[PDB]
Design an enzyme around this catalytic site. Sequence first.
Site, PDB file in Angstrom:
ATOM      1  N   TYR A 110      -6.102  -6.596  -4.041  1.00  0.00           N
ATOM      2  CA  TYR A 110      -5.522  -5.548  -3.084  1.00  0.00           C
ATOM      3  C   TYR A 110      -4.697  -6.198  -2.235  1.00  0.00           C
ATOM      4  O   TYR A 110      -4.579  -7.362  -1.802  1.00  0.00           O
ATOM      5  CB  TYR A 110      -6.841  -5.143  -2.309  1.00  0.00           C
ATOM      6  CG  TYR A 110      -7.064  -5.843  -1.089  1.00  0.00           C
ATOM      7  CD1 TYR A 110      -6.682  -5.560   0.071  1.00  0.00           C
ATOM      8  CD2 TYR A 110      -7.904  -6.973  -1.264  1.00  0.00           C
ATOM      9  CE1 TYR A 110      -7.113  -6.359   1.299  1.00  0.00           C
ATOM     10  CE2 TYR A 110      -8.313  -7.953  -0.284  1.00  0.00           C
ATOM     11  CZ  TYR A 110      -8.018  -7.650   1.045  1.00  0.00           C
ATOM     12  OH  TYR A 110      -8.324  -8.109   2.224  1.00  0.00           O
ATOM     13  N   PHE A 151      -1.243  -6.297   6.159  1.00  0.00           N
ATOM     14  CA  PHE A 151      -2.260  -6.784   7.060  1.00  0.00           C
ATOM     15  C   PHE A 151      -3.068  -7.796   6.392  1.00  0.00           C
ATOM     16  O   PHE A 151      -3.438  -8.511   7.033  1.00  0.00           O
ATOM     17  CB  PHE A 151      -2.909  -5.881   8.115  1.00  0.00           C
ATOM     18  CG  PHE A 151      -3.768  -4.888   7.222  1.00  0.00           C
ATOM     19  CD1 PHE A 151      -4.815  -5.221   6.814  1.00  0.00           C
ATOM     20  CD2 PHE A 151      -3.135  -3.729   6.987  1.00  0.00           C
ATOM     21  CE1 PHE A 151      -5.599  -4.139   6.111  1.00  0.00           C
ATOM     22  CE2 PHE A 151      -4.097  -2.517   6.238  1.00  0.00           C
ATOM     23  CZ  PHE A 151      -5.105  -2.921   5.705  1.00  0.00           C
ATOM     24  N   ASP A 152      -2.813  -7.514   4.857  1.00  0.00           N
ATOM     25  CA  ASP A 152      -3.926  -8.263   4.243  1.00  0.00           C
ATOM     26  C   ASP A 152      -3.471  -8.335   2.608  1.00  0.00           C
ATOM     27  O   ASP A 152      -2.576  -7.380   2.285  1.00  0.00           O
ATOM     28  CB  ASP A 152      -5.165  -7.515   4.267  1.00  0.00           C
ATOM     29  CG  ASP A 152      -6.366  -8.374   4.065  1.00  0.00           C
ATOM     30  OD1 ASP A 152      -6.159  -9.541   3.843  1.00  0.00           O
ATOM     31  OD2 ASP A 152      -7.565  -8.158   4.348  1.00  0.00           O
ATOM     32  N   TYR A 185     -11.141   1.689   9.965  1.00  0.00           N
ATOM     33  CA  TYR A 185     -11.812   1.375  11.339  1.00  0.00           C
ATOM     34  C   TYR A 185     -11.791   1.938  12.525  1.00  0.00           C
ATOM     35  O   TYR A 185     -12.106   1.582  13.631  1.00  0.00           O
ATOM     36  CB  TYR A 185     -11.020  -0.232  11.535  1.00  0.00           C
ATOM     37  CG  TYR A 185     -10.895  -1.059  10.386  1.00  0.00           C
ATOM     38  CD1 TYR A 185     -11.969  -1.998  10.263  1.00  0.00           C
ATOM     39  CD2 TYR A 185      -9.971  -1.334   9.578  1.00  0.00           C
ATOM     40  CE1 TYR A 185     -11.948  -3.012   9.513  1.00  0.00           C
ATOM     41  CE2 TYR A 185      -9.961  -2.223   8.379  1.00  0.00           C
ATOM     42  CZ  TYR A 185     -11.134  -2.964   8.225  1.00  0.00           C
ATOM     43  OH  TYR A 185     -11.196  -3.939   7.182  1.00  0.00           O
ATOM     44  N   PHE A 191      -3.582   1.188   0.906  1.00  0.00           N
ATOM     45  CA  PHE A 191      -4.135  -0.014  -0.018  1.00  0.00           C
ATOM     46  C   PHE A 191      -3.501   0.283  -1.226  1.00  0.00           C
ATOM     47  O   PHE A 191      -3.811   1.466  -2.048  1.00  0.00           O
ATOM     48  CB  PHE A 191      -5.540  -0.304  -0.129  1.00  0.00           C
ATOM     49  CG  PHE A 191      -6.130  -0.352   1.151  1.00  0.00           C
ATOM     50  CD1 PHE A 191      -6.221  -1.916   1.508  1.00  0.00           C
ATOM     51  CD2 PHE A 191      -6.661   0.366   2.038  1.00  0.00           C
ATOM     52  CE1 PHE A 191      -6.760  -2.160   2.769  1.00  0.00           C
ATOM     53  CE2 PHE A 191      -7.252   0.056   3.079  1.00  0.00           C
ATOM     54  CZ  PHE A 191      -7.558  -1.247   3.582  1.00  0.00           C
TER      55      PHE A 191
END
Length: 128
Positions: A45, A55-56, A101, A118
Amino acid sequence: GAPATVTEQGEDITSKKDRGVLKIVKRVGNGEETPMIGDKVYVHYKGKLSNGKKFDSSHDRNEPFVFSLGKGQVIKAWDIGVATMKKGEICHLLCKPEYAYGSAGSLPKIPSNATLFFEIELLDFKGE
Protein backbone atom coordinates in the site's frame (compact mmCIF):
# COMPACT_ATOMS: atom_id res chain seq x y z
CA GLY A 1 -5.29 13.34 -9.42
CA ALA A 2 -6.12 9.92 -8.07
CA PRO A 3 -7.46 11.18 -4.68
CA ALA A 4 -9.87 13.57 -6.41
CA THR A 5 -10.93 10.85 -8.84
CA VAL A 6 -11.87 8.32 -6.12
CA THR A 7 -13.58 11.12 -4.15
CA GLU A 8 -15.74 11.99 -7.18
CA GLN A 9 -16.03 8.60 -8.95
CA GLY A 10 -15.71 5.98 -6.19
CA GLU A 11 -18.31 3.51 -4.94
CA ASP A 12 -19.55 3.49 -1.34
CA ILE A 13 -18.65 0.12 0.20
CA THR A 14 -19.86 0.83 3.76
CA SER A 15 -22.65 -1.14 5.44
CA LYS A 16 -24.18 2.16 6.60
CA LYS A 17 -24.03 3.71 3.11
CA ASP A 18 -22.69 6.88 4.66
CA ARG A 19 -20.03 7.38 1.94
CA GLY A 20 -17.31 6.95 4.57
CA VAL A 21 -15.24 4.58 2.41
CA LEU A 22 -15.25 4.93 -1.40
CA LYS A 23 -13.52 2.43 -3.69
CA ILE A 24 -12.29 2.13 -7.28
CA VAL A 25 -10.95 -1.19 -8.57
CA LYS A 26 -7.75 -0.40 -10.49
CA ARG A 27 -6.76 -4.01 -11.38
CA VAL A 28 -9.18 -6.92 -11.29
CA GLY A 29 -7.84 -9.79 -9.22
CA ASN A 30 -8.14 -13.56 -9.47
CA GLY A 31 -11.36 -15.54 -9.35
CA GLU A 32 -14.30 -14.66 -7.09
CA GLU A 33 -13.04 -15.32 -3.57
CA THR A 34 -12.42 -12.54 -1.05
CA PRO A 35 -10.67 -13.24 2.31
CA MET A 36 -12.59 -14.26 5.41
CA ILE A 37 -12.57 -12.86 8.89
CA GLY A 38 -9.43 -13.88 10.75
CA ASP A 39 -7.39 -14.61 7.63
CA LYS A 40 -3.78 -13.48 7.55
CA VAL A 41 -3.76 -10.92 4.73
CA TYR A 42 -0.65 -9.52 3.03
CA VAL A 43 -0.94 -6.15 1.30
CA HIS A 44 1.18 -3.58 -0.43
CA TYR A 45 0.00 0.00 0.00
CA LYS A 46 0.63 3.71 -0.10
CA GLY A 47 -1.22 6.32 1.94
CA LYS A 48 -1.61 10.00 1.31
CA LEU A 49 -3.04 12.85 3.24
CA SER A 50 -5.37 15.41 1.70
CA ASN A 51 -2.43 17.93 1.65
CA GLY A 52 -0.62 15.64 -0.79
CA LYS A 53 1.90 14.22 1.75
CA LYS A 54 2.69 10.50 1.39
CA PHE A 55 2.55 9.34 5.01
CA ASP A 56 3.22 5.65 4.56
CA SER A 57 4.33 3.02 1.90
CA SER A 58 5.06 -0.65 2.22
CA HIS A 59 6.90 -0.49 -1.13
CA ASP A 60 9.38 1.98 0.36
CA ARG A 61 9.87 -0.41 3.34
CA ASN A 62 10.48 -3.44 1.11
CA GLU A 63 7.96 -5.52 3.07
CA PRO A 64 4.21 -5.97 2.95
CA PHE A 65 1.82 -5.05 5.73
CA VAL A 66 0.40 -8.17 7.37
CA PHE A 67 -2.70 -8.30 9.54
CA SER A 68 -5.63 -10.51 10.54
CA LEU A 69 -8.74 -9.38 8.67
CA GLY A 70 -11.76 -8.06 10.57
CA LYS A 71 -10.09 -7.83 13.97
CA GLY A 72 -9.59 -4.06 14.35
CA GLN A 73 -5.84 -4.40 13.87
CA VAL A 74 -6.04 -1.67 11.19
CA ILE A 75 -8.36 1.26 10.58
CA LYS A 76 -11.98 0.42 9.87
CA ALA A 77 -11.65 1.42 6.19
CA TRP A 78 -8.96 -1.26 5.67
CA ASP A 79 -10.96 -3.98 7.40
CA ILE A 80 -13.97 -3.10 5.18
CA GLY A 81 -11.97 -2.43 2.04
CA VAL A 82 -9.60 -5.39 2.04
CA ALA A 83 -12.63 -7.63 2.73
CA THR A 84 -13.93 -6.64 -0.73
CA MET A 85 -10.73 -7.52 -2.61
CA LYS A 86 -9.67 -10.58 -4.58
CA LYS A 87 -6.10 -11.90 -4.60
CA GLY A 88 -4.07 -9.83 -7.05
CA GLU A 89 -6.53 -6.92 -6.99
CA ILE A 90 -5.33 -3.31 -6.74
CA CYS A 91 -7.83 -0.72 -5.52
CA HIS A 92 -8.03 2.89 -4.37
CA LEU A 93 -9.82 3.75 -1.12
CA LEU A 94 -10.94 7.22 0.00
CA CYS A 95 -11.50 7.10 3.76
CA LYS A 96 -13.28 9.72 5.86
CA PRO A 97 -11.88 10.14 9.38
CA GLU A 98 -14.70 8.14 11.02
CA TYR A 99 -13.23 5.08 9.20
CA ALA A 100 -9.62 6.11 9.85
CA TYR A 101 -8.02 8.00 12.78
CA GLY A 102 -10.96 10.25 13.68
CA SER A 103 -10.51 13.37 15.79
CA ALA A 104 -7.50 11.86 17.59
CA GLY A 105 -5.28 11.57 14.54
CA SER A 106 -2.09 9.56 14.83
CA LEU A 107 1.16 11.28 15.69
CA PRO A 108 3.46 12.15 14.16
CA LYS A 109 2.02 11.46 10.72
CA ILE A 110 -1.70 12.03 10.61
CA PRO A 111 -3.59 15.11 11.75
CA SER A 112 -6.96 15.29 13.42
CA ASN A 113 -10.03 14.87 11.19
CA ALA A 114 -7.96 13.56 8.26
CA THR A 115 -9.51 12.12 5.10
CA LEU A 116 -7.03 9.56 3.72
CA PHE A 117 -6.28 8.10 0.30
CA PHE A 118 -4.82 4.63 -0.16
CA GLU A 119 -3.69 2.46 -3.00
CA ILE A 120 -3.83 -1.18 -1.84
CA GLU A 121 -2.74 -4.42 -3.54
CA LEU A 122 -3.96 -7.70 -1.98
CA LEU A 123 -0.96 -10.00 -2.33
CA ASP A 124 -2.25 -13.07 -0.50
CA PHE A 125 -4.65 -14.28 2.14
CA LYS A 126 -4.57 -17.49 4.20
CA GLY A 127 -6.45 -19.01 7.09
CA GLU A 128 -4.41 -19.89 10.20
